[PDB]
């Protein structure tokens, strides 16, 4: 008997081209399919309707695209969510699923020409309107300039349909304003629940003539290092030449929001040839906190405050290097990227992530598993190393411990971490499993990724699996879907997946198969793998000189990028960033926003086939009752 099923994201976004994939396992001949979306629980309005046909030429698999209009009925009446009953009619059979709907349908990025302003100056800022795919979108957005006390001083409403997603704006700071961290808040009129904001400081200042860089020698303090923390003060004029002067350096211990300053650490050093060196002796650090015990300092972060004064005395600059962790191990191991569920009796792949205490990925640091130190792996440029370990068919929690094994460190300095991986529950205790695996290189667009489909299951039914269905989720949407063929007696097959720029920043590949197993029940076995693609502009944009300049000179500036794109420029004196370098717009933040807005928040398979899809963000519904548990929270657990 045919098994009709539909797969769609478990969160739908208003006014967006959400994609849904339909399939007819074991179907014969063409089958017309009708997709309808109704309000829930009303079931009164047909927000959308689509139709298509599944044919053998397409392997009885096809996608349907629909966009639910942003009807005014969708409101946070009392904070409750809203739902829509996706309903698909496979000829006579009807398959329907209730899917959560999220109103927030895009992002707003706010760029201010400067990070700090003086009273009476004009705040020039832009708002970028982009849907969840980061493409330009025309919608009505309203922005509020917020006083530090929280009073909205200026309120505007604008529509971006006349521009290619950029909304220039301005505001003149009154001379009588109050100082502090002013805020700009903006949100689409259709989703007041989500407000995007950016902070710009208002302060009285004069641009400094040079920048001061405080660079610790090792970007951390090893609590047993008797040499003490060594810091190099580097000062140079903004126009490139080196500084000469005197610098005052004071160290302090920070624990959470609280700060302690070590008065004994205050040292005066001469800055010659633009650089100078200062040392925070361990004795001073210990005595500054009443010397309770060496270990008591672990976990607390030092900070260095440096003030540089030119020998002419005409200028002064203050710079701080906060967050210099005090650690006993030079490395930290994170399991944030590993799957927390394992397939018994099959290899388990750990994407152990080891980083320096400051959070920067570590490079070429060996890692190993306790009890199996014979096998070791080295981190890639992104700090992720892959470790494979066999597992027994035990159906019991698996405890795994990894240890950095760098040659130059003592055993006590090696970082370590532990985690538990729960067994993957198999329907009907049929011990049928699917396992995806990828060779974790520094993946970048333009490469070909060989995804391996490893199948373990009883020989009595091996011939019934003749294709694996797979889906690729990116930015919370089905980027692609397709089927990989398999032959009987072929336990492993490789899918030569080609990667375009669309896959940036990461894509969660989900795969599964289905069969009529023991007792004729309909078994569905699914697995997921999370793959990271190096972050970069999906397009490109390079600014370079088209030809040093003297003041007032004409300069030919060359801009090269995507054809037909709208380019918005801004020039800022570097002196501004000396005073305040926070809240700068950068491509990394854009990807950070996208990643934090992903609908699935697990790196791999779940407890069962339902968990696999739910964790990846996909719903799966079938004629034979196979379903994923309902999702009722926009922010996923914890």
């Amino acid at each position: 008997s045919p098994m009709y099923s539909i797969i769609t994201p478990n969160i739908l976004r208003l006014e967006s081209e959400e994609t849904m994939v339909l399939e007819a396992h074991d179907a014969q001949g063409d089958v017309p399919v009708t997709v309808t979306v109704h309000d829930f629980p009303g079931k009164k309005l047909v927000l959308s309707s689509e139709k298509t046909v599944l044919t053998p030429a397409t392997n009885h698999m096809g996608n349907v695209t629909f966009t639910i209009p942003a009807n005014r009925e969708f409101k946070s009446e009392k904070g409750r969510n809203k739902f829509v009953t996706v309903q698909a009619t496979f000829g006579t059979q009807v398959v329907e699923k209730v899917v959560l709907v999220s109103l927030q349908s895009g992002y707003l990025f706010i760029q201010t020409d400067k990070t700090i302003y003086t009273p009476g100056s004009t705040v020039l800022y832009r708002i970028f309107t982009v849907n969840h795919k980061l493409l330009p979108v025309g919608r009505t957005v309203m922005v509020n300039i917020e006083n530090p006390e929280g009073i909205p001083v200026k309120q505007d409403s604008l529509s971006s349909q006349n521009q290619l997603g950029v909304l220039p704006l301005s505001w003149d700071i009154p001379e009588l304003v109050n100082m502090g961290q002013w805020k700009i808040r903006a949100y689409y009129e259709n989703s007041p629940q989500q407000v995007f904001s950016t902070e710009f400081e208002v302060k009285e200042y004069v641009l400094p003539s040079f920048e001061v860089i405080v660079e610790p020698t090792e970007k951390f303090y090893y609590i047993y290092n008797e040499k003490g923390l060594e810091v190099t003060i580097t000062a140079r004029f903004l126009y490139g030449k080196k500084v000469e002067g005197t610098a005052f350096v004071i160290f302090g211990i920070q624990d959470g929001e609280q700060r302690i300053s070590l008065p004994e650490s205050l040292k005066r050093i001469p800055i010659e040839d633009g650089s100078g060196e200062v040392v925070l002796s361990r004795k001073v650090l210990l005595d500054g906190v009443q010397n309770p015990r060496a270990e008591d300092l672990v976990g607390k972060s030092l900070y260095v405050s440096a003030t540089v004064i030119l020998h002419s005395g005409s200028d002064m600059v203050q710079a701080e290097r906060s967050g210099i962790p005090i650690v006993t191990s030079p490395y930290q191991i994170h399991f944030t990227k590993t799957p927390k569920y394992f397939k018994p009796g099959m290899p388990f792949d750990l994407m152990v992530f080891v980083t320096n205490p400051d959070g920067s990925p570590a490079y070429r640091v060996p890692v190993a598993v306790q009890g199996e130190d014979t096998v070791q792996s080295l981190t890639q440029g992104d700090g992720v190393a892959k470790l494979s370990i066999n597992t027994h068919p035990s159906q019991k929690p698996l405890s795994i411990t990894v240890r950095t094994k760098k040659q130059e460190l003592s055993e006590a300095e090696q970082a370590t971490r532990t985690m538990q991986a729960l067994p993957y529950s198999t329907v009907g205790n049929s011990n049928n499993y699917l396992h995806l695996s990828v060779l974790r290189t520094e993946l970048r667009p333009g490469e070909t990724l060989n995804v391996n489909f490893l199948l373990r299951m009883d020989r009595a039914h091996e011939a019934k699996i003749r294709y694996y269905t797979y889906l690729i989720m990116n930015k919370g949407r089905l980027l692609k879907a397709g089927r990989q063929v398999r032959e009987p007696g072929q336990d492993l097959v490789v899918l030569p997946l080609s990667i375009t720029t669309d896959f940036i920043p990461s894509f969660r590949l989900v795969a599964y198969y289905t069969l009529i197993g023991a007792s004729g029940q309909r078994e569905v076995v699914a697995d997921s793998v999370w793959v990271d693609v190096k972050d970069s502009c999906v397009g490109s944009l390079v600014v370079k000189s088209g030809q040093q300049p003297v003041p007032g000179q004409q300069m030919t500036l060359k801009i090269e990028g995507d054809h037909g794109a709208r380019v918005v420029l801004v020039a800022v004196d570097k002196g501004v960033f000396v005073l305040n370098k926070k809240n700068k717009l950068t491509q990394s933040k854009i990807w950070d926003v996208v990643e934090k807005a992903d609908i699935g928040c697990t790196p791999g398979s779940g407890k069962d086939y339902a968990g696999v899809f739910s964790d990846a963000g996909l719903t799966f519904t079938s004629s034979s009752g196979q379903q994923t548990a309902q999702r009722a929270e926009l922010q996923c657990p914890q």
Binding site: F40, P41, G42, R80, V98, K114, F128, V130, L134, P136, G150, I151, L164, V166, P174, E175, L176, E204, V206, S209, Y239, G240, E244, T246, L266, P270, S312, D315, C537, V538, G539, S540, L541, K544, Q548, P549, P551, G552, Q554, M555, T556, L557, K558, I559, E560, G561, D562, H563, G564, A565, R566, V567, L569, A571, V572, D573, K574, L585, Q587, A632
Partner: protein, 751 residues
Amino acid sequence: DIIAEENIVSRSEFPESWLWNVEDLKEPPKNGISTKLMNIFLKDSITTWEILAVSMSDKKGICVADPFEVTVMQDFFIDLRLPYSVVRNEQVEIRAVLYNYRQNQELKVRVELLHNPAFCSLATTKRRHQQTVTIPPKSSLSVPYVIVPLKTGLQEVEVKAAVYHHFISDGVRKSLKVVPEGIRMNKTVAVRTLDPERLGREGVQKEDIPPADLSDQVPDTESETRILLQGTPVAQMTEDAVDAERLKHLIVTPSGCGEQNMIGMTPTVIAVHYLDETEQWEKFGLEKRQGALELIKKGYTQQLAFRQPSSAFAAFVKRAPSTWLTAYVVKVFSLAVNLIAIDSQVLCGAVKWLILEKQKPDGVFQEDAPVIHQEMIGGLRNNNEKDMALTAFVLISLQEAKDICEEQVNSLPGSITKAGDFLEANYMNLQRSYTVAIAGYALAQMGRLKGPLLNKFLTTAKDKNRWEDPGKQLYNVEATSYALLALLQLKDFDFVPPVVRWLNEQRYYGGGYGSTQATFMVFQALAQYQKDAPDHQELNLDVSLQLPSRSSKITHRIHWESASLLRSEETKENEGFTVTAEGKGQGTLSVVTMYHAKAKDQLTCNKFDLKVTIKPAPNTMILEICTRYRGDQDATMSILDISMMTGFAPDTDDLKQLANGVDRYISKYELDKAFSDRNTLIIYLDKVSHSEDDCLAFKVHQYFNVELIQPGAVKVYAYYNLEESCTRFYHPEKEDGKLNKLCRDELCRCA
């Protein structure tokens, strides 16, 4: 052999940000990339510009380019280190820093400060403040200038320089924000509360905001008054809804004869309706709705089997039609209209049959075939005023089906009006609480419930919370639900809370035998309460301001949907004005004023004390500096900046002696510098006592003679709070150290 002053163009454009421009790429692509060339003009600032480019494409989305850095540079230039702001009449010193970055060339530089009427300085319209200096290669020199601002607002300071034997020159014209001799301060003019219904009169409230005192306001100073019309939304208490899990047993498959089918289907219909209204499906499980709807559809199909030819209904086809059963079926289907696809023909035919065949001319409905299951009719099980109860029940059903079958049955309004008239003609004579409640709901459905009718309806309530009547408590619950529905119809929300509280406290979640009518009615009433009960105190304030400075009546409106918004107004004037508020709601009108108040105490030089003096040595002079820290402890580390007067330089030996001191440190850079050109000096102090005057002194003597000697300056401050410095001036002749000026009536004339 020097560039004339007039010929030196002056750099004046120093924007901190520029090139705020939008460019669209349109050139023919090459290899999928298009290039655009821009001819930008670099501003006059000598710094490293950072150019950040963001591009948006309809296909490639957003992209942020790696910032590009342009380093504007020049072999020789001057940088003016002007403070952000200065006081209207406080003598201040500014430093012009000359840079010579020529790898191996020493420069003789003529530097002068141009005269501005806005500033008092050594420069005058008759003679310019010239000065000849020498700058070693790859070095810097600072020439101090003493100026006294004289006019508020932005003022421009211009400095020009030229190099002997070279065609190299530079000149800078920056701007200072001269401010009055005061400190910004804010005062709360008034903080009122707007509440027309409670604090106003006749529905309106008038407030008058007195003009701010501002006795300390400095003359000719800008002032601003800010008005905030903050709304204060007030939440309204709302009783909790029935927990979803309690309803788990209501959903049941319908079955049995025409009567039993109603028994089975009605709890499912009412449970589904309640869940839809309260939106409890999330906890109940979103999937179960499909099964519930399928069961409802099955029940409807089964019920249609018993539809008699005349569109009526009965327990069996052969049995005569029952008026009550038909009315109940109409009620249930009307509830199911928005759940499943019911044939409007069946409902309208039943309504038409009821109106035409089962209503007396006077308007009374009559029942001739009592229902088989007497427990079904709930509170009608025992009746004395049966006519009135049955008429009210039928009228409720007809009113519910009105909007569906009004167009199809033209006679319906007449029947409804006749029934209402009959009810009014006898409402006063009712005895049972159940009958009173049901008839009250029937009347309220058409707005006839008023005056003595409403008085009797409310009076019958036991304990002002329930229409109890001794007997089976299910009948009491049914009557209370009817009364609650009537009250919700009347909008009397001040009486509902106790009734809903009593209903919830009864903790009744439906049941089986003899629980159909009670379950249906109680759940419908609770759903209606959740739908219609107000969760927020009404907030529709309409407010206005009458400002004499304003030519028109400014106004604003605040609704519950916009209460949180902090609507505000700004005024650049100090005056009394009147604020008028109307409508329901609440709001905290707040008015504050900002201004520059005359100084209360030493506005500057509070942390430190300076005692600079200069005396002839036993030309040469002995400069003596004494310092103290006004505080509880010694200063951690202080910078003692000294600016020598024109033509005087410190004695090398004395500096070496001081540098060789215990608590004082002087950079090797200064000691190595030649005797001449050491016009600026810095002495670093490890500590300065707070209980005593720490003093130092060293010889200073002329290396060059000039017509007029600009006063020297001394500045002291801790290494971390330069803004909290103290400064002093010294001069061999003008003992005070201040430039001559006549401040008639607090307006100072240079001299």
